[PDB]
Amino acid sequence: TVSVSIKVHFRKLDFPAVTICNINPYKYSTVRHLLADLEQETREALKSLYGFPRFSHRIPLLIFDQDEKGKARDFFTGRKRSIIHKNVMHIESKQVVGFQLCSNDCATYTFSSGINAIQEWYKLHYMNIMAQVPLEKKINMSYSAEELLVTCFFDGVSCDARNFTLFHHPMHGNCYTFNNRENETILSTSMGGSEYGLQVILYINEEEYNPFLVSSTGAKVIIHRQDEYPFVEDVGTEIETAMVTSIGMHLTESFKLSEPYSQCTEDGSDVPIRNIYNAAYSLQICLHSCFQTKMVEKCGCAQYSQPLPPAANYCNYQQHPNWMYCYYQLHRAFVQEELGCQSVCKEACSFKEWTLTTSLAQWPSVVSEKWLLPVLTWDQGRQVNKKLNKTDLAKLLIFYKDLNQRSIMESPA
Amino acid sequence: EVSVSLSVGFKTMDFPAVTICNASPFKYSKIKHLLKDLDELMEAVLERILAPELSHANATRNLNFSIWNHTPLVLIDERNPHHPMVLDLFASEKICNAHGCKMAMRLCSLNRTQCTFRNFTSATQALTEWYILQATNIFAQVPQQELVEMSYPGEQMILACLFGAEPCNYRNFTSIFYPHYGNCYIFNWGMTEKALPSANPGTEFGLKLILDIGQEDYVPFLASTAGVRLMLHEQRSYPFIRDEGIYAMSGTETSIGVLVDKLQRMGEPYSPCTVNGSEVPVQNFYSDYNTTYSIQACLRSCFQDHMIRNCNCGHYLYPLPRGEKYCNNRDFPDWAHCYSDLQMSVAQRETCIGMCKESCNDTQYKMTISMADWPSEASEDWIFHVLSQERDQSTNITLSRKGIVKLNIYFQEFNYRTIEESAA
Numbered sequence A: 001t002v003s004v005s006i007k008v009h010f011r012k013l014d015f016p017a018v019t020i021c022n023i024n025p026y027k028y029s030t031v032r033h034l035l036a037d038l039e040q041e042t043r044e045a046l047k048s049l050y051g052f053p054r055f056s057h058r059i060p061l062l063i064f065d066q067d068e069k070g071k072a073r074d075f076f077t078g079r080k081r082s083i084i085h086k087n088v089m090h091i092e093s094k095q096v097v098g099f100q101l102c103s104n105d106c107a108t109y110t111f112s113s114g115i116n117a118i119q120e121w122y123k124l125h126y127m128n129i130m131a132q133v134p135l136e137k138k139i140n141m142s143y144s145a146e147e148l149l150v151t152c153f154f155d156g157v158s159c160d161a162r163n164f165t166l167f168h169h170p171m172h173g174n175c176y177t178f179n180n181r182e183n184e185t186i187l188s189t190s191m192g193g194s195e196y197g198l199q200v201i202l203y204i205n206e207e208e209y210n211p212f213l214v215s216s217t218g219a220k221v222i223i224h225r226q227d228e229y230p231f232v233e234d235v236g237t238e239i240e241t242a243m244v245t246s247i248g249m250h251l252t253e254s255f256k257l258s259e260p261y262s263q264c265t266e267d268g269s270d271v272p273i274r275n276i277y278n279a280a281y282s283l284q285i286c287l288h289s290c291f292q293t294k295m296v297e298k299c300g301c302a303q304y305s306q307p308l309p310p311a312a313n314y315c316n317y318q319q320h321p322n323w324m325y326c327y328y329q330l331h332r333a334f335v336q337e338e339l340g341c342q343s344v345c346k347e348a349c350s351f352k353e354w355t356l357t358t359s360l361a362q363w364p365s366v367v368s369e370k371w372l373l374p375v376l377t378w379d380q381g382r383q384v385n386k387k388l389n390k391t392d393l394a395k396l397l398i399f400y401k402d403l404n405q406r407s408i409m410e411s412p413a
Numbered sequence B: 001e002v003s004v005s006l007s008v009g010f011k012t013m014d015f016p017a018v019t020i021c022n023a024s025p026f027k028y029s030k031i032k033h034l035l036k037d038l039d040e041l042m043e044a045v046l047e048r049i050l051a052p053e054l055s056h057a058n059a060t061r062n063l064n065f066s067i068w069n070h071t072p073l074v075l076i077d078e079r080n081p082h083h084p085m086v087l088d089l090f091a092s093e094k095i096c097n098a099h100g101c102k103m104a105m106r107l108c109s110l111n112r113t114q115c116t117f118r119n120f121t122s123a124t125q126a127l128t129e130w131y132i133l134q135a136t137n138i139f140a141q142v143p144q145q146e147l148v149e150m151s152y153p154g155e156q157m158i159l160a161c162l163f164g165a166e167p168c169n170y171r172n173f174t175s176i177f178y179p180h181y182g183n184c185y186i187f188n189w190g191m192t193e194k195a196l197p198s199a200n201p202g203t204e205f206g207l208k209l210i211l212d213i214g215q216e217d218y219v220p221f222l223a224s225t226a227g228v229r230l231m232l233h234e235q236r237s238y239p240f241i242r243d244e245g246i247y248a249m250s251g252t253e254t255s256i257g258v259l260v261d262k263l264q265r266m267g268e269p270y271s272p273c274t275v276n277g278s279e280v281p282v283q284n285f286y287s288d289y290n291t292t293y294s295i296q297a298c299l300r301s302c303f304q305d306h307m308i309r310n311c312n313c314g315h316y317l318y319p320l321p322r323g324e325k326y327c328n329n330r331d332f333p334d335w336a337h338c339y340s341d342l343q344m345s346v347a348q349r350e351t352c353i354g355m356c357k358e359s360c361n362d363t364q365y366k367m368t369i370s371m372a373d374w375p376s377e378a379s380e381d382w383i384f385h386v387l388s389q390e391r392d393q394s395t396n397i398t399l400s401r402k403g404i405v406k407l408n409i410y411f412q413e414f415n416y417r418t419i420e421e422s423a424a
Ligand SMILES: *[C@@H]1O[C@H](CO)[C@@H](O[C@@H]2O[C@H](CO)[C@@H](O[C@@H]3O[C@H](CO)[C@@H](O)[C@H](O)[C@@H]3O)[C@H](O)[C@H]2NC(C)=O)[C@H](O)[C@H]1NC(C)=O
Pocket: B037, B063, B064, B065, B066, B067, B138, B141, B330
């Protein structure tokens, strides 16, 4: 059995790996020609809600009267007519929109608000399409570093797009990562506070967001160890446009003792699960990597929301009709801890985490706006010719609050 | 041998000391008479970068190049490796911004016989750095007792204030001229008076502040960011809000939950820890503010000390030992260069870092920050009318809605985590 402790020291310190991603995965105009057909059926659907009189054939939208169960009706077929509730503007609609999935018996979804259903339904067909496009075309089709980043600095030293590793994410496009280029010295800070950390100005043109994906105009960032995997879909911090985001941070280093009643691994060598992520071991990695494998074993393909195991295709209805139901089964089984993954996988015996302490400020200030934006388009001035609008930019600072090597340590008893 | 202790909980205790500062160190309308020429020059520089075709020799060459000659910008054109070129900014006249073109300041000394180019890879960086340095060269010439009046007075900033249930008004804060932000207002500093306690967690028992930024009066080319700078710290600490401070955005009810850590170190061979700073050889210039010792204070005064040796002068952003003087180029034409050396030579970072001992009795205020837009429609008009009648107490009324920040600063449901390192 074990006991706990806390300790810290004040050495000049190494800097984390910083990943940046535009929340909008692809320049809308550059994907439009792939999606236009779907952008007709969606709008036709929305046009069905109020004010007006092939994809739908695969995943048919449905209207469910809560008067009945096992009874559902085509969203484009006939309908008419409200359940009371306690100005007052809340009521529950007797009808509700949804869609279903089947294997050949079926499983469904239904959404509080019609418009919400459509936008989920759209997200399905969006993936059902993009899963069929090759990586090179995607990477060519998403943002480039030299246009995503307007400027950046680190302890006054400048940085170019050169200093960023490309990292393509299936759901967020071209993410870029600072301070983790291979065979180069990891950056470090000898001073705490903003002006000694990373500062960068992002460009985020709302004009190219594809409307049918719900999001705010902004960018994600993730802080992680150089050999670690971002998991952009989950753990990131989003940045709103037209603001400073001052992400101060403390480093924290964690450790745990190995006992039969306190198990862990130093590098994952203990588990049979192969690691498909090309990144250091971690509980989340070993789980998902096991999940993808279990899926390929029983649905003949891999989920598009994750990297792709070897000798497998990315799932898509057009090639695997019973795909989504198969997925649904597994995911539920996984949540029910029925799949082996949840049992044989284990934590790391030690890890680092950057405890963030974010805060926001309006930028540029209303007076400064009159000149700063012109200059910020003389910078980048051969790549862009518009006068940038305030909402096209976002300023970001990453910096250590204090150069303190905080840690948590254990001793046996 | 070693010994340790650990804990968590809540208890009635002394509230932090809190500082508020406006991000623009001066009310433009109260100082532009002193910056008119610099701004006029700045506008031309921008014109001469952004759109030269709009310029005219009979319009530009009226300007006060005696300011420019002190520390000019230059284009470094090195996209011809076999022959680089340097151009002072004073069929198109458009200046280069290609890959091989860099924007730089030519710092100089010794009747400007010696000079060094300081680089920036973007105009936005260069221009801000330049203006800041020029402005600094002007502010130094002003006696503080007058300059203090050109910052936002508390009477304008702190529209409304409350502490738990207890009443409040700007006169309850202490005022210090923190040179990078002008007037900073410290709450509950515990220096002049006994510090306030607080009995309970939750917003109902913290600070409530409603602050007015007055964006319309910011110094145009300074102060790129809007919203109050804010910091928490122990009683009788300076604080060094330029580095350790949080922001809070206008038009929001930025709400800060607080949690306290405290630590003491084991001893010198485990870390050179001093109890009250009486050991170190550094003069600790800040002592006129009766603050305690702190690693920060020692570093900065150490920097200032070296500069008083190397440049017979003291830089504007740090206090002065009473006999010395701030660095006007009028009086020390080489100060900018002399200063830059102490910035660039990392040996001068480390010699102080080696000389200044760590502070014992460490105290840290962990913060969790949260926001929501404010006021909502259910509150705006009538609260802003109430506050309008607060601003109506001005000799002549002035109003705005874009400029108001609201803060809540309070302890979390557990408010202390004592920890210890002790020899045994
Ligand atoms: C460019 O602008 C500078 C900065 O304002 C001008 O400097 C100003 O010069 C006047 C006249 O010399 C100064 O007023 C006088 O100061 C002396 C002592 O310094 C005093 O004995 C006189 O009674 C009078 O007050 C003024 O202080 C000074 N301003 C600053 C900030 O130094 C300069 O004239 C302009 N040059 C050109 C080429 O346009």
